[PDB]
Amino acid sequence: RAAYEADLTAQQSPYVFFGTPLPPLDPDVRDDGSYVPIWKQEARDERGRKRFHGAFTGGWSAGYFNTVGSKEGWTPSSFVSSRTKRWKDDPNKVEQRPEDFMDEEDLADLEESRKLQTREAFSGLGSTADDAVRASGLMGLFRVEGETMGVKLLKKMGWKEGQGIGPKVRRKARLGLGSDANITEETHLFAPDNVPMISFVRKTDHKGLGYAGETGLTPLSKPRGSIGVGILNDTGSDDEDPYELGPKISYNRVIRLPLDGFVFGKEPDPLISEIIAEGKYPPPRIPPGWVSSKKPSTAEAAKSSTLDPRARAAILGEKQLPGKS
Amino acid sequence: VKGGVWTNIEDEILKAAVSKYGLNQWARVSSLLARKTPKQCKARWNEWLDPSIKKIEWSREEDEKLLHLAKLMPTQWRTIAPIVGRTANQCLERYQKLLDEAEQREASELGLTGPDGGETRAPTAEDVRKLRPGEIDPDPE
């Protein structure tokens, strides 16, 4: 029946010259790659049969058919040494690693426990873990950001955090002495301030602008650990605590007629009003006597463009960043 | 969504599954459908889709029977309905319709019926019983 699925895949997906074609959409041939929820999935082993094999993974057998041995058996490798051929200075030191004594299940669980995370110098997608550090008060005043290296490379070229970017601002100061303008105003070159970011509130509803909406009601309040009762006998978590009844009680310490539903604007929009208005700019005088002085490829130049940015910015009058000196 | 208004396709699949399966097996009948529970299919069969339900305009003697039974058994509509010969919701709707029609008659010979179709006419209970935009029918079956 391999020829039937083979030429059915050839007929349904003829132009697959890259990757692997999908199995055909038919009731006869199942879809192995399709994701069928979890409440629809079945527990199968490496061989496809529906059984378990561990004692702590829900099987009625364990090991090599209820035996702690193996089909290949065990053979103790030998060890001989003397003053002449001493073991410590031999070149082929076969070391006694904790993996000769393990099994494929042990290695599988070892790599299962070994997770993946980004390095300290690079930030990842969706990383939101600094709020607990920052929203702590005096605890967060000592724990500063651990120098993600983009901030460090901006630091090297002349940036200090707490202020924005741009050309340097020539404002004198504020000393905390109110708004005194009697200062000499000799105007040191400061750094531009940081404009804040934007954070739009999530909008899934169709509720309009300025609408408060209906407010909700809150529910009426609400050697560590133990050996479990089973993942299927946990039912509704009938056990919380035997020694006292109920949840944790939190305590205080004290004791033309317009359209229907539309109102007429009391004032017109100014922004549409300057469209037909004369504006606030008088046109130029234009005295008689002025005369127009001017009487009435890119790809090839880009190919010949040998101007590297070291020499491209030289004619642009820009100061290059300091390098390795 | 589990529930909702009943369509003609769902009604005919319900009738076909009742034909193939019977009345004591509602889980299979609901398994032919997609948006309806076994209890909802059973309620739709027992309230509308059974053709032992009288689905025409009421006769007059049915109306005196309904009014006398609503006089002797206040608000026991599941008891009144077998005796009258209709369903509980049908008997309740006809009773409320008779009450609203008598209210309209009292307004008619009282003089409250002025301009026909005007906005000053006080509506009946049927207009209030009409669903507002954003409201759920309690008896979709």
Next chain:
Amino acid sequence: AALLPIAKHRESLLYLVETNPVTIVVGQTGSGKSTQIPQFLEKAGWCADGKLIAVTQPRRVAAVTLAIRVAEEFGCEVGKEVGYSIRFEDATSESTRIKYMTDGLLIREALVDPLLSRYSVIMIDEAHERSISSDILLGLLKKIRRKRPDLRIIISSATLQAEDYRAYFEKASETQEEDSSNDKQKESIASIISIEGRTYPIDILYLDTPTEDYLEKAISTVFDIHTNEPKGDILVFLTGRDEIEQAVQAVSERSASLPPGSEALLPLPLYSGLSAEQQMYVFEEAPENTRKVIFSTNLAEASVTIEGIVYVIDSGFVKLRAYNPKTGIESLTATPVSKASAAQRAGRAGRTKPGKCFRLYTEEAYQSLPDATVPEIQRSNLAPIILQLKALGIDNVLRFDYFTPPPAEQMTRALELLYSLGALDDYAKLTRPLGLRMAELAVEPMMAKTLLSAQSFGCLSEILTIAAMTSLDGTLWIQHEGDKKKTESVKRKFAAEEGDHLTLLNVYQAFVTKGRKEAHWCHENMLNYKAMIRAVSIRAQLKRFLERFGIDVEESLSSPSVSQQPANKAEKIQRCLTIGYFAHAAKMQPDGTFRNVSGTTVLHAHPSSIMFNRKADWVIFHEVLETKDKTFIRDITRIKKEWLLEYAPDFYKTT
């Protein structure tokens, strides 16, 4: 042309472009500035010395339509004397004098002549939109004009924010403060001329109470304005495609319930990726005893103009994209409209006859709205922008004359992204031409880094094809709602289990090699034609770009040498992809959703990718976007974890 008010000030602004080095123009859209000002400059003798007039447009299709209109008004063919240049499409000639470009194409074409001696007048239209390229070109022109005062700059600030441009245009440099010893009068470098347009009076009506459903309130507004007010086509400003679909379905269902003998109502959607048939149905006038209801997105605000429109309903919302700096994902969220955007939406009604405005919010709700939109440079991924700025040679991006400075930690994320993608060293400098090779490519820098780290590992032409498919906005498949299993089957005609990029490679190879460049074959295959032959041209242009990189081209697709095994070739392609796309890595969870390497944010497969129902363990995605509530990821491709631990040793580390 003559009836437009712009000619009434014509010679005046000519005096300005002969006297002031920079001259900001204030004018409402529709006064004919874009159609006549380049013509006025060409007739003033500014092209007699072999010079050029540049019109920089933030919008692409608006640039094409404006160039076509100016060519039609000039009596010349498009590209002969009036031409255009947008991304990957340059229709110009040597005899061309008036040229309409994308402003981003001025940013990218600036790596030809840094002084821009090929051009004499640079005018920036729709400057009130305030795109990123507009501000970068403003800084570039300000820095160029220090060395070339003969270059003239015109700004079409349609709003009352032209004073901000003027205040930007006396601040020249800190270096000129030392030479300011003479008592000479400060000459007016920047002069703002206000050419006033004409609009018929429009009545604006607000609400006494805020609404609970602006879509249904807008539908009720349309039906009340049809039943009460006389004949006139209705335009409504909506946000998304789904709201327009629900609106047209609801008005069709209620127009089925309309009484006979009244005027029929024709619903018409206005999306960005519309087909030709729906677009020409929208642009064509209403039939006899028929009144049109155009449910439109933001296009009709600034990009396109539909005639015979009397009514316009502003929902008070517009979708906006904002790249989060801390997380690193986009967010297409429904922002409340700005004061200037709502003013333009109101003013787009009364064009042919005096209409009415029907903003769906209270009058006090039009009092705390933002005066202008959020700056586009503050809510975008700055990594291509910092890449372009270092391509021009300005590596001091901290000390750069921005129009509005981006906030201080977004470009830190951008520099982190650029360092992870090769390009930059530890000293914040563009490197030995690695960084230069990502500098000049018009691709997203992620897979430009991939294409550089392709030749050392074999396959180059296949992911060059995938690069043609990725730099492509409007999707290849024509969205056929009537076909559900047929769309899956024709998506399964070219399906690859090892990711979604290989499906695009398969459809390109089917079109080019065996399809013989035939469009009707794409018509049975439910695929578009124009954007994908544009992608063919893009692949040719990128092949030319890597020909200028000095690496020879290995085009083995034409050769029948299939002796290399295809499984190793496929894993080679996806291995190069995860060499590139290591930052956009995710792991699928048992509940069906995906999750990042940090394991914090919930990600879902986009319902257009091949792996919507397929099971995978580790994936890469081309781009992540946040919808209304779910955060989707596109172009799902299967990878391995040890590929991440091998090709990102400084980014990722195991426990």
Next chain:
Amino acid sequence: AIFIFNPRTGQLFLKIIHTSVWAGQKRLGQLAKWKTAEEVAALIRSLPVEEQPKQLIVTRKGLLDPLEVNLVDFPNISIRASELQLPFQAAMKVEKLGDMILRATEPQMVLFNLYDDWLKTISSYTAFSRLILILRALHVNQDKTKLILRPDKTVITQDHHIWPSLTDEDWIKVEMQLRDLILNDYGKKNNVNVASLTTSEVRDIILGMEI
């Protein structure tokens, strides 16, 4: 006096400024802030790179202006305004400190250890909290804090120490008594009940943030 305190190690740099700087000068607050920023920058330049600070927390917002002028050469050092009303001024109310501040005839650097010998027993967080509490209590009442810190004549302050030597339980009792004094003062000043205050309100009163 200019105070530069290290919270991690307890090191305190006291820059004593004499009247000779203020002789013949006008707008004394302005060049006072400038001289303070210049002295901080000079002490930073004198300190080695390993001992150079990474963050500067200023009790006054105005120091954001001159220090940035005085620390152009050090972009790796950040300056942050403190929203906490830190009672670092109340360090004049120690008798010995004000004694050599007033008797000093020249501007000079003086080294102090505000934690004394707490770091051998407790961590830097508890020592910092105790120092902040002691400074707040001194700002509230100098004599009452002196009486609480020395409840008996057997409690003798060491010559090299500023606070008298006490055991851990004695320090806990002193901390609780100073907390009671500060809470009573805050309740009397702001007309708030003392016994009804939660832990967050008590900690915010101790830290001095604007509630």
Next chain:
Amino acid sequence: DDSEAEERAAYEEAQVRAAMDGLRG
């Protein structure tokens, strides 16, 4: 909130009257 104070007080006399059954008489 004055109403909240009133109905929490109502809880307070409810608990006292629950505790004072027979003693009040």
Next chain:
Amino acid sequence: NTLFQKDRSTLSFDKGFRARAEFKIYQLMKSNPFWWTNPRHDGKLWNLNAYRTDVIQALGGVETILEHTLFKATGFPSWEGLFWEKSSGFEASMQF
């Protein structure tokens, strides 16, 4: 304690809860062993943690109990700092 709990007001609008708990047997198939007491109205009426301490002391001690078990075969140096996981990753995987 009930005079100091957080939600005394909504609990003041709760009347007739004892007869309701008596009639709960006609609504739920699960029986309530504590039908007679309401924690939000009566409070916690017993405390049995001294039972835990004295049953630890009654069995000799922690060391005798751990001598009955495979504690020394785990190689853990001290008992304090040792927590049990209720389920397993595989066991929680095979839940539905």
Next chain:
Amino acid sequence: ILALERLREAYSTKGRLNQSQREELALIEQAYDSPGTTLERIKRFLLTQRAFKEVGIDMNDNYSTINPVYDVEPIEKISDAYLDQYLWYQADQRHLF
């Protein structure tokens, strides 16, 4: 709040719910999110509804006696719980018992 809290005590126990229990939990969460619409629905049901769904009947076995257990529709259970709490509170206020 009290009515929904006593409706949760049956089924807020996490895990192993049938379809009606999940519908009840969804209805209770919907009532928590939007209280006013739920209250208007309940009052409309008290004014108008006089015909109700079928009530399932089962037996609970204590091994000495068995007792009936009634299964009511969740929407009617919400209405009945609100009515029960309101009636008990108003009879406590008016000294009925």
